[PDB]
Design a protein around this ligand. Structure first.
Ligand SMILES: NC(=O)c1ccc[n+]([C@@H]2O[C@H](COP(=O)([O-])OP(=O)(O)OC[C@H]3O[C@@H](n4cnc5c(N)ncnc54)[C@H](OP(=O)(O)O)[C@@H]3O)[C@@H](O)[C@H]2O)c1
Ligand SMILES: NC(=O)c1ccc[n+]([C@@H]2O[C@H](COP(=O)([O-])OP(=O)(O)OC[C@H]3O[C@@H](n4cnc5c(N)ncnc54)[C@H](OP(=O)(O)O)[C@@H]3O)[C@@H](O)[C@H]2O)c1
Ligand SMILES: NC(=O)c1ccc[n+]([C@@H]2O[C@H](COP(=O)([O-])OP(=O)(O)OC[C@H]3O[C@@H](n4cnc5c(N)ncnc54)[C@H](OP(=O)(O)O)[C@@H]3O)[C@@H](O)[C@H]2O)c1
Ligand SMILES: NC(=O)c1ccc[n+]([C@@H]2O[C@H](COP(=O)([O-])OP(=O)(O)OC[C@H]3O[C@@H](n4cnc5c(N)ncnc54)[C@H](OP(=O)(O)O)[C@@H]3O)[C@@H](O)[C@H]2O)c1
Ligand SMILES: NC(=O)c1ccc[n+]([C@@H]2O[C@H](COP(=O)([O-])OP(=O)(O)OC[C@H]3O[C@@H](n4cnc5c(N)ncnc54)[C@H](OP(=O)(O)O)[C@@H]3O)[C@@H](O)[C@H]2O)c1
Ligand SMILES: NC(=O)c1ccc[n+]([C@@H]2O[C@H](COP(=O)([O-])OP(=O)(O)OC[C@H]3O[C@@H](n4cnc5c(N)ncnc54)[C@H](OP(=O)(O)O)[C@@H]3O)[C@@H](O)[C@H]2O)c1
Lengths: 169, 167, 169, 167, 169, 169
């Protein structure tokens, strides 16, 4: 059993993330998906709580017919010590074989701990990113079209738009 | 629409826990399952890491016919302040309506925060017996779902607990 | 200006504590009162939150005609490092000259940091202590008579008795 | 019976803050005053310790005619999780009914937790001006209650901030 | 370069520890010595601070002619997650190859992380242990004969006996 | 016995630091050397772990013939409360008499706690500083000539150049 790992803030989870995830699922048996910076919420850059993001991911992966036997969803708080972050991830996750990240720090930390590391198989453009999603939530643009419907429903339930607009005053 | 919450150490996850979970799923649309004391591992009482327990639960709920749309699995570290623990849980979980616990402290903490609280529908198969059988070469496997046994083989759980029990 | 310091869990604040406080106020201009183990609540030994204990002290000292200019009330969480606890107290409090404690560890920590340390001027018996108060709350004894009335009112408002009884099941 | 809450860094406590407080006390029976960012000291922006600020507030509210039965003064450290901060405040404070803040984050956090929230009744005297005058030998004293000036003399606040502003 | 690691509380550092250290130095080029439970001080079981123990070890190893090029002395606080403790040690130390410990937990944690683990080459009897040292400090026994002279000098300077006696009241 | 204290990040330890250390050793019997920001690693500004820096200092001071009896090397994590940092240092170190620092904050914190504070006896120019070392590591300049040979050897073993280059992508 070959297990990959992916880590991202997912503020919020959007179609870009999902596309990356599906691409990774072509080359691993199971994917561990870590929601990074789980401690950060209620800012313009990081509006949603760990729990809200768990909800988004859990619903999105279920709505798209990905079998539950092929993924794990795990919130992970940042820590002060970079040299310990890999150990922190390992404690919170099933054993894994390969890490997917385009981030140099994430790459290097996992590589120094002896893991295989590769870039994600797909890169999405800025117009489909979290920054664009949040900007559209703020400016009454079409944020919904950038997200799976199951994520839009989470955002409606938790009043995500009202939250982010209030925080931008 | 109606979401329940359950919290336990699950050291390890056994057929008892699964029976309770299925029973709760007859009363709620979705169940949030929190793995408590996520920080504790590598002792006789708490042998498995948070990650290992996430793995056990994820596999066990998938192997049994439970749709993924009906549960969430969330590791939760203990904190020093009891008066903050409910807030900690809330931050880490989807919104929920009702808590299932037989533990007086858990009940009272959630009750003071305005949640409906009730005992689990079923009382049972115990973690103490599972761990004792792992230590004494008893039939621990029969107390667990097969998917959990497979996790324990992969992570060398028995060897771990036996080593930790030395002098 | 001569400033004393006193530290206790005050679970809850009872007439014994108050008697000690009044005795200390005969020999200092101002008394800093620290509520220790501020992080502990919702147990048989430590039922009340920091905030609840602040309330108890603030009300009790006001009801008994002690002028506000003569005291400070400060919640203090325990820390893991004993060697740092005095520094932690100092950061959270006004400057002070003398510490009142009968506890050997508290005495020694403050003495090693160069403070004058003395035992409290009065010692109350076990039958008037927090242990007796909590035991009476549990067993339907006369807990009210061990407390100032203003503290009884705090306990009624926060449902302290119901809390402690539930926790003892 | 009706309890308000106010939160600010109070670096230092000045006549502005006191005016706001007196104005709030016309609308509530009791006011909980939280000294925020209690962990920050010894910078140009945040020169004073939690303890020093507790001292300033305690003395200033006593010197002005405010009865002790009408307020509580509580230092509160910042925490990493915004979603926990309200729970943190609640643990450290008496129960309260209404929050006074002009800060959008503070407003929204308390509002999501079910509290009534409103802007302070008065907008003003600023901490930035006080600190600038301490640094540049201006008339900082006139911006503060006399009891606060006395705290700052005792703790050598001016000398501290001047030393910290060096190269 | 073959590097060993040893970890102990060293409350205080005594001749037994030193004997073990010298035996280990016959088998490795360099020895990393970690002072565990660095956060604990001012109790009967753990009287000395991290700093005081660093002082004891530094002085003792220098007085006994062990070259400075052959050891490292590193204080290490305990952490709540056993699954992170090895990562915590690794962050605070030079790279190492082999761990010396008789403790089952320490053995298993390091072993799971891929390190070679072995028992210490020598075991000292109870009569020469920290427990006996501390007991003799309390009861006016001959504690000095159980410690290197350089450690005795540290304990005199920091008033260690006076401390532990006060804490036992 | 007169004991000084020095604190710096030492990212990495270079000849400038060593020169300052030797100058201080003309004025004190013993020097406590604290490695500050011990929690920070794996960034352009702070590339090396606490352990790696302990290794650099231990090797450099031993290669240059400074007797082991004249120094202590101690990693110190930053903390959020400036008013506690001196207490944190004191817990982790032997007792000391005088602090050497050019940093206003460090000076004032120690000074408020009653310590004698002075500037270091020597100031090295920017061209010999950590910033210049790290810049040369990144840009294939002569970084080696700015460090003691023992430190170069540490950096080769831990692949420090490869690390910092990867982190700069
Ligand atoms: N010491 C520690 O605690 C530590 C150390 C290292 C990393 N971490 C954490 O690990 C998490 C992940 O690190 P990160 O740097 O990747 O943070 P991140 O928040 O996930 O940022 C990565 C950036 O790249 C974008 N991105 C990710 N995958 C992409 C793809 N396939 N194509 C295009 N753009 C892509 C993201 O866009 P979107 O805005 O669309 O998501 C985001 O703008 C973070 O929470 C970080 O804080 C923690
Ligand atoms: N401040 C804080 O951090 C805080 C505050 C409150 C609670 N917590 C945490 O929350 C968790 C919940 O506490 P808990 O005591 O309920 O969990 P627990 O540690 O799993 O203990 C419950 C005990 O009752 C058993 N049990 C649970 N459900 C049962 C059922 N339906 N029938 C029969 N037996 C049942 C368990 O058996 P098994 O061994 O077989 O599972 C276990 O022995 C703990 O991890 C605790 O640390 C933390
Ligand atoms: N590292 C750290 O964080 C650290 C280090 C040292 C101390 N502390 C904290 O400092 C606080 C105070 O320490 P403590 O040992 O005094 O704890 P404590 O909870 O205040 O206990 C002292 C005991 O003596 C009793 N007592 C106090 N004053 C008395 C008097 N005048 N006459 C008779 N009985 C009296 C108290 O009785 P009642 O039950 O009636 O109150 C209690 O039973 C605690 O919260 C402790 O945790 C923390
Ligand atoms: N997660 C967390 O830990 C968390 C989350 C939210 C907030 N907080 C904390 O809570 C505190 C509250 O935030 P805050 O931004 O309101 O406090 P703040 O840091 O005091 O900032 C408010 C600013 O507005 C000014 N101000 C306040 N009330 C005013 C009034 N009635 N009229 C005119 N100006 C007024 C203050 O001036 P002066 O300088 O003169 O006082 C200050 O410049 C902060 O310490 C923050 O760190 C923490
Ligand atoms: N999660 C975590 O933070 C974590 C996990 C594992 C371990 N640790 C820490 O690691 C450190 C070391 O663990 P430990 O279990 O070895 O603790 P320890 O307290 O340093 O040693 C345990 C006992 O063994 C004795 N001993 C050690 N070496 C001996 C020898 N060669 N011959 C005879 N007796 C010997 C010690 O004697 P003396 O009294 O003479 O010293 C002590 O009584 C501790 O600080 C522990 O807290 C931390
Ligand atoms: N609350 C807290 O946790 C707290 C409070 C205060 C300070 N600290 C910590 O204390 C440590 C030391 O503070 P610092 O401000 O001195 O930081 P630093 O980063 O160690 O030094 C500051 C700068 O001064 C340079 N420098 C040092 N000594 C010099 C000399 N003799 N001649 C010329 N340049 C010299 C350093 O050069 P190089 O680049 O060559 O090294 C560096 O560029 C830091 O780790 C800091 O984080 C922590």
């Amino acid at each position: 059993t070959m297990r990959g790992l992916l880590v991202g803030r997912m503020q919020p989870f959007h179609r870009g993330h999902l596309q990356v995830i599906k691409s990774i699922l072509e080359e691993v048996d199971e994917l561990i998906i870590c929601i990074g910076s789980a401690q950060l919420s209620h800012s313009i850059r990081d509006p949603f709580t760990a729990g809200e993001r768990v909800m988004m991911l859990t619903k999105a992966l279920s709505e798209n017919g990905i079998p539950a036997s092929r993924y794990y969803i795990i919130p992970v708080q940042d820590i002060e010590c970079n040299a310990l972050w890999v150990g922190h991830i390992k404690m919170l996750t099933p054993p894994f074989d390969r890490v997917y990240s385009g981030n140099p720090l994430v790459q290097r930390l996992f590589s120094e701990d002896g893991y295989e590391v590769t870039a994600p198989p797909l890169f999405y453009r800025d117009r489909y990113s979290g920054t664009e999603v949040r900007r559209r939530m703020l400016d009454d643009g079409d944020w919904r079209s950038l997200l799976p419907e199951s994520v839009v429903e989470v955002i409606d339930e938790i009043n995500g738009v009202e939250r982010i607009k209030h925080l931008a005053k």
